[PDB]
Design a protein around this ligand. Structure first.
Ligand SMILES: [Zn+2]
Lengths: 31, 48, 126, 49, 346, 58, 58, 159
RNA sequence: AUUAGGGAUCGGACGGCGUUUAUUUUUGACCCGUUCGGCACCUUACGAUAAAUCAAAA
């Protein structure tokens, strides 16, 4: 499995797609 | 967190796609032991 | 069609990285892309570039670029949130950089730490 | 050993730089019987002869 | 293990060397620094520094005395003398900005300088008469310079033509030799101190080793632990080369890769040079020839050299068709080392 | 397979080449001093520092 | 020919000045041309040179 | 117009008058033009050059008539580089200054070469069909645009 | 964002060392070089991934 995938969202080429659910989850991990 | 030289050899010999992880291996703060064998089979190395 | 000519350029950029070509031709160009190339040359993934008009850009590289990517929803982020976004994007906290449009302009997470500003994450490189 | 091949060296040089017999020629090639544009040139030359 | 270790800059260190006495030198974009490694207690701090002249692309040091030169990217080179200079002499093509990658001090004729510029162009310099001397413009770019440590007018350039060009300073009318030896563009060259051999270190996974007078590959070297070779230089016996990789490695390799060194016996060297002479005599026949030129080669590289041969064969085909069916037919066919130069300029 | 395919580039003629080689360096057919003087190499590199040349020699 | 001339353009001026520098350098290369020619058409080259032999005449 | 005449401004006013009279057999932008503006600062060491600031329809008036005009201007007037330019009071104005500086040749390319650090340089490459009589004027033109703008742009015929 | 080009395919348009129309200029047929555009092969994937689908499910 590719090392070069960060652990957040799906990528199509260089477009890393993030949902608002994922972003709000990041905010929750901050909180 | 030591890395046998055989393991370092295996992770270079793997494709360029793991270059970041190879760098992380390559880090200098962690000690190293050489080996005396022929041809880079990591599992045999560690178990020995 | 892909309206982010930014990401289209960076697609070509990672394509040149994968194909070992030491140059590119960003056929439609713009200043935010130029600023991104300035920061990538600030920390040295790229050798040197220039822009020509009829406008396109040629960029000579090393090989020490691994990946460039864009944050498509263009998210907002603050300081402790910057630390969390850093660790949830990058492999290790001392490699690569993320790309943050601040009110002071465009800068990395390291420059954002130096100047203590929040802003919007739009992309990254490692 | 190491002497030259005449035919092969002629092929090499070529690829680098690039009344009494015609009667036996026609008699030998009258049995083929490819229409043979070179035999057409030979027939016109024998006609001029 | 290591002799002496320190961090030097922020960005990627572009240049490095040693002083003729003992000290060592570092260029990077942050600046020029000077440490002393073989101090009896170690210090990490430098003992000389400069930050003025823009991003410093490379170093070049004097064969005998305490001269060095720093090539920047502003289309400018500038020379210091140790212990007696601060900002040095700034020399350039007097109306020129385009960047200077590297510079090698000649060691045949000292006090002479050549440098490469990104106009696909080279410039020869002098230090007595403080001025550039000449500027040659070729078809596509050049990456790193050298002059031969025996044949003074003979220089060599390492070029994004994927090519090593042997030029001669007095006469830039034709390339003295064309080394058309690669797929990817050459990252480095170094003349052997014999003056008879040459390392050409590609961007790709390939060192190729050379005499001065083949025009083709005597040796190809690699192993897959080394993706992209960068700095490829000889040692002082001209037997053992060094190979600084992209994969984070310093490698110690050999030239003439089948010669097992040491101290031989008399009949041994007899047999070895006997092999040499015999191979010299018969180095053309198909059998021995193919077992001679048959190295082993990585897959993308071999596919790509087939690609290069096919594409350039088509290119030559289009050229000769244009010649035969154009008015170029009533002209002299220019030879390839004549064709090698585009233009020359003073 | 043993016949010479291409003329080696330095030579010019068939008699030049095929009457030039003509002789075996090997030890069984010539003297020992013949052997030494023939088989010595064009460059001889002895062991040590090869710095570039300082002064003219010729 | 004591006449001063019209001050020419800076481009042609530096062109001829660096041309004079080129002629100087070419003279200093002709001072080795014969030695390079020797080591070309010579019989057997030797390394290391006893001229940079750090113990030369002792 | 806008000027009270200076020591060489009155000289070039009298010069356009002496081009009106006692000469050719060419007069289209000679008579309807007055003293408009000019400036003289040295170019390099010792060498000097004159810029003449011109009203915006008299620019195309000159583009009708500039052949032989700068030539007579230099051979009678002080033997230095004579150059006409528009009189204006941002970036598009700078490009107008450039394309009006280089009047006989059309530019083709603008290469903004970046460096390994935050420095940039501008270069403009010109047309090939006129290359001869431009090189010894190139340093002059560049010193002019630098002194008028403050920006260092270098001019080239590409090779 | 291209694959990677090459072989041909014709639609133009451009050129020419030339043959035939041509009694000589047009112009047309053959050949070549340039150029866009496309039906499609093959190889290498630049990767894929759900495989049998691939120069596209890259
Ligand atoms: Zn082991």
């Amino acid at each position: 499995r590719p090392v070069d995938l960060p652990a957040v969202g799906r990528m199509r080429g260089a477009e890393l797609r993030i949902s608002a659910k994922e972003a709000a989850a990041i905010a929750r991990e901050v909180r | 967190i030591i890395i046998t030289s055989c393991v370092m050899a295996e992770l270079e010999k793997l494709g360029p796609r793991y270059r970041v992880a190879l760098m992380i291996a390559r880090d200098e703060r962690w000690q190293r032991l050489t080996c005396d064998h022929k041809g880079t089979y990591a599992d045999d190395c560690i178990v020995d | 069609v892909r309206t982010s000519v930014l990401h289209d350029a960076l697609n070509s950029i990672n394509n040149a990285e994968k194909m070992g070509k030491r140059q590119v031709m960003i056929r439609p160009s713009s200043k935010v892309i130029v600023k991104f190339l300035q920061v990538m040359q600030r920390h040295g993934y790229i050798g040197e570039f220039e822009e020509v008009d009829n406008g396109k850009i040629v960029v000579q590289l090393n090989g020490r670029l691994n990946k460039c990517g864009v944050i498509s929803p263009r998210y907002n982020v603050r300081l402790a949130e910057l630390e969390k976004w850093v660790t949830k994007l990058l492999p290790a906290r001392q490699f690569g950089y993320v790309i943050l449009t601040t009110s002071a302009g465009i800068m990395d997470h390291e420059e954002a730490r130096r100047k203590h500003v929040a802003g919007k994450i739009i992309g990254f490189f490692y | 050993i190491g002497n030259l091949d005449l035919r092969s060296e002629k092929q090499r040089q070529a690829e680098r730089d690039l009344n009494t017999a015609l009667k036996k020629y026609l008699r030998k090639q009258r049995k083929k019987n490819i229409i043979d544009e070179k035999r057409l040139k030979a027939e016109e030359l024998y006609r001029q002869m | 293990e290591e002799t002496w270790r320190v961090a030097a800059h922020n960005n990627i260190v572009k240049g490095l060397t040693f002083t003729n006495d003992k000290k060592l030198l570092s260029c990077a974009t942050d600046g020029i620094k000077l440490w002393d490694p073989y101090a009896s207690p170690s210090n990490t701090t430098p003992i000389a520094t400069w930050q003025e002249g823009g991003p410093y692309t490379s170093l070049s040091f004097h064969r005998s005395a305490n001269t060095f030169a720093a090539s920047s990217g502003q289309g400018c080179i500038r020379i210091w003398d140790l212990e007696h200079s601060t900002a040095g002499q700034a020399i350039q093509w007097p109306s020129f900005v385009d960047t200077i990658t590297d510079v090698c001090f000649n060691q045949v004729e000292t006090s002479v300088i050549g440098s490469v510029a990104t106009d696909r162009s080279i410039i020869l310099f002098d230090l007595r008469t403080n001025m550039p001397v000449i500027k040659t413009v070729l078809h596509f770019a050049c990456n790193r310079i050298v002059f031969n440590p025996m044949e003074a007018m003979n220089l060599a350039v390492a070029s994004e033509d994927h090519n090593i060009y042997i030029f001669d300073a007095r006469n830039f009318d034709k390339a003295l030799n064309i080394q058309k030896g690669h797929v990817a563009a050459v990252m480095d060259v170094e003349f052997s101190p014999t003056g008879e051999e040459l390392v050409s270190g590609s961007y790709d996974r390939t060192i190729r080793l050379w005499r001065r007078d083949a025009g083709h590959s005597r040796d190809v070297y690699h192993t897959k632990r080394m993706q992209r070779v960068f700095r490829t230089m000889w040692t002082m016996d001209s037997k053992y080369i060094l190979t600084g990789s992209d994969d984070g490695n310093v490698r110690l390799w050999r030239a003439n890769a089948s010669e097992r060194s040491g101290v031989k016996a008399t009949r041994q060297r007899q047999a070895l040079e006997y092999n040499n002479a015999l191979l010299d005599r018969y180095g053309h026949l198909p059998e021995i020839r193919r077992i001679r030129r048959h190295r082993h080669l990585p897959k993308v590289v071999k596919k790509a050299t087939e690609i290069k041969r096919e594409e350039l064969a088509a290119i030559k085909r289009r050229e000769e068709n244009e010649r035969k069916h154009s008015n170029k037919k009533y002209e002299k066919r220019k030879s390839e080392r004549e064709k090698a130069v585009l233009v020359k300029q003073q | 397979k043993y016949l010479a395919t291409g003329l080696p580039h330095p030579f010019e003629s068939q008699q030049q080449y095929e009457r030039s080689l003509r002789l075996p360096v090997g030890p069984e057919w010539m003297t020992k001093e013949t052997f030494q003087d023939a088989t010595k190499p064009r460059v001889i590199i002895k062991q040590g520092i090869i710095a570039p040349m300082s002064k003219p020699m010729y | 020919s004591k006449k001063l001339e019209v001050p020419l353009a800076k481009r042609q001026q530096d062109r001829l000045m660096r041309e004079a520098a080129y002629k100087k350098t070419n003279e200093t290369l002709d001072r080795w041309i014969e030695t390079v020619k020797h080591n070309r058409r010579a019989e057997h080259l030797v390394f290391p040179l006893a001229q940079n032999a750090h113990d030369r005449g002792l | 117009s806008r000027q009270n005449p200076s020591d060489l401004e009155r000289a070039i006013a009298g010069a356009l008058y002496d081009l009106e009279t006692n000469t050719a057999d060419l007069k289209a932008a000679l008579r309807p033009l007055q003293f408009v503006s000019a400036r003289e600062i040295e170019v390099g060491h010792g060498k000097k050059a004159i810029v003449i600031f011109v009203p915006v329809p008299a620019l195309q008036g000159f583009h009708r008539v500039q052949q032989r005009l700068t030539r007579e201007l230099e051979k009678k007037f002080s033997d230095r580089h004579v150059l006409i330019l528009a009189a204006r009071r941002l970036t598009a104005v700078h490009d107008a200054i450039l394309t009006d500086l280089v009047y006989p040749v059309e530019i083709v390319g603008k290469r903004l070469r970046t460096k390994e650090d935050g420095s940039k340089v501008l270069k403009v490459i010109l047309d090939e069909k006129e290359r001869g009589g431009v090189d010894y004027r190139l340093d002059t033109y560049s010193e002019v645009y630098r002194r008028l703008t403050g920006r260092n742009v270098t001019f080239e015929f590409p090779q």
